[PDB]
């Protein structure tokens, strides 16, 4: 009439790589190993040595009564690709489960500061069917790749992997037995910063030269020259917008680069207005407001002013 | 003989991956189906959990687990873990993870 204590499960996760970020779906691929270790029923093994049971032989041991609880990735999108898997069965009842996995995982990702964004890649683990009165996680160890030089890396890892063990309490479990609606959850977090070198030298810098060069229209001598050249500048930003889009990640919001593109449109458009205004302002026909046309310094400073905010 | 009443719960984790031309989208979540079947014996006459590959073994021996079809799913959905909770009084709670294109 005395209940049995929960089965403690020690977990070790080995992360090989985090890649394949899909900005729109807020997913990312993770390749690694997962190790889970608990103590079950004592059993006989050949020569009383630890026994190794690999892959499809595991299901034969399950059919004959070996207990192997299903551990689910809470935030995995779809069924993960499982490679080799292994059971090490000890005589004293210990079981060690080791498996290779590759899966797509989901997370909350904010790319508004792109290309200077920071992300938190997480894996959440939880038993699929056994609550924390039957099965609980006792500890979680995480191991990651030893980086040599991160210069060629898309992401720069910062800090050691963070981990949590916590209880998830569900309000919609049919049966309502006292303290039978909580599950043990492992959470691992990997913090990283994007390597912005490629986006700084190939995207932001040329766009600054294109926008700056557009301010040279105010150094042309005739109104007709200032107007027709602006359209070449307008066409140069459109050309650059297409070059941007075809390479930058799709997002439901504008990034830093997207706002620079917008700022170039406004500047060029504002210059077209200023050019026309100065040439027709006086409404007399000799509209030659050279003083305002001498805003070759005031227009870039007005731009830089609006951008600071 | 009356019809079996099935209580269904659907948890939706994510809706993403809209395909505009094909008018489809992806949904990740769980589907829980409860219903009362025939009384049966279970270990210690307690609720019994059966997971994944062991579910099939139970069907062969007589357990009734009806297939619930997603009418508007595109191709076979990606079913992850699935589970049965079997009660001695006949209750069955089927629970399964799914990812599908709808």
């Amino acid at each position, epitope marked *: 009439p005395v209940d049995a204590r929960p089965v403690d499960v020690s977990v070790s996760i080995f992360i090989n790589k985090i890649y394949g970020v899909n900005t729109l779906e807020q997913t990312y691929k993770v390749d690694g190993y997962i190790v889970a270790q608990w103590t079950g029923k004592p059993r006989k093994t050949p020569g009383d040595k630890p026994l190794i049971v690999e892959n499809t032989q595991i299901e034969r041991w399950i059919n004959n009564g070996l207990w192997v609880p299903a551990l689910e990735f809470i935030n995995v999108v779809g069924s993960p690709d499982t490679g080799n898997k292994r059971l090490m069965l000890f005589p004293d009842g210990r079981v060690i489960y080791n498996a290779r996995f590759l899966g797509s995982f989901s997370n909350d*990702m904010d790319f508004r500061l792109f290309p200077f964004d920071r992300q938190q890649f997480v894996l959440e683990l939880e038993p699929f069917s056994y609550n924390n009165q039957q099965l609980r996680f006792s500890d979680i160890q995480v191991y990651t790749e030893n980086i040599d030089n991160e210069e060629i890396d898309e992401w720069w890892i910062r800090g050691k992997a963070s981990t*949590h063990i*916590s*209880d*998830i309490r569900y309000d*919609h479990l049919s049966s309502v037995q006292p*303290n039978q609606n909580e599950f043990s959850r492992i959470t691992v977090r990997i913090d990283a910063v994007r390597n912005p070198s490629y986006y700084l030298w190939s995207f932001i810098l040329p766009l600054g030269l294109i926008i700056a060069a557009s301010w040279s229209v105010f150094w042309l001598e005739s109104f007709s020259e200032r107007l027709q050249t602006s359209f070449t500048c307008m066409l140069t930003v459109v050309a650059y917008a297409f070059y941007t889009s075809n390479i930058l990640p799709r997002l439901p919001y504008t990034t830093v680069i997207d706002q620079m593109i917008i700022a170039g449109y406004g500047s060029i458009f504002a210059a077209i207005l200023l050019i026309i205004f100065a040439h027709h302002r006086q409404a007399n026909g000799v509209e030659d407001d050279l003083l305002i046309q001498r805003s070759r310094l005031a227009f870039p400073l007005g731009f830089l002013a609006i951008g600071s905010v | 003989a009356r019809p079996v009443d099935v209580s269904v719960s659907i948890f939706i*984790n994510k809706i993403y991956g809209v395909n505009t031309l094909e008018q489809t989208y992806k949904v990740d979540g769980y589907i829980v189906a409860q219903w009362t079947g025939k009384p049966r014996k279970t270990p210690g006459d307690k609720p019994l959990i059966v997971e994944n590959t062991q579910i099939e073994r139970w069907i062969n021996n007589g357990l009734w687990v009806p297939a619930l079809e997603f009418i508007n799913v595109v191709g076979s959905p990606d079913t992850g873990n699935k589970r049965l909770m079997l009660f001695p009084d006949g209750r069955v709670i089927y629970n399964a993870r799914f990812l599908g294109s709808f």
Partner: nanobody
Amino acid sequence: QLQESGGGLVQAGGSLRLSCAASGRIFSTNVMGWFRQAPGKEREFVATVGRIGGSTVYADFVKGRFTLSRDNAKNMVYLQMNSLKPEDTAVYYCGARIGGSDRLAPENYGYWGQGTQVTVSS
């Protein structure tokens, strides 16, 4: 701006009902989470809402003693604490999630209130 309340001194095994009042630009109460910090020790996670509806995330030391409830209309959340123990003595803060993806990480919370002291004696 966040403001806690409900603290107080209590004997071992007693109860309290912390309350957090939200005022300003918070879309809903799903963002608020309870934390605590004892003298010397670092601020640690206690409770907040889970990702999927009906679920709530509790720290491993809760052990079913505490419950998180909310009143989206009044923009408040309550932490009903029971079976309190001397180890639960600390300043209980109320924070608001900003971003990232770690409901349990204090690094991703801000707008902390002044806190409320909880004292359990024998």
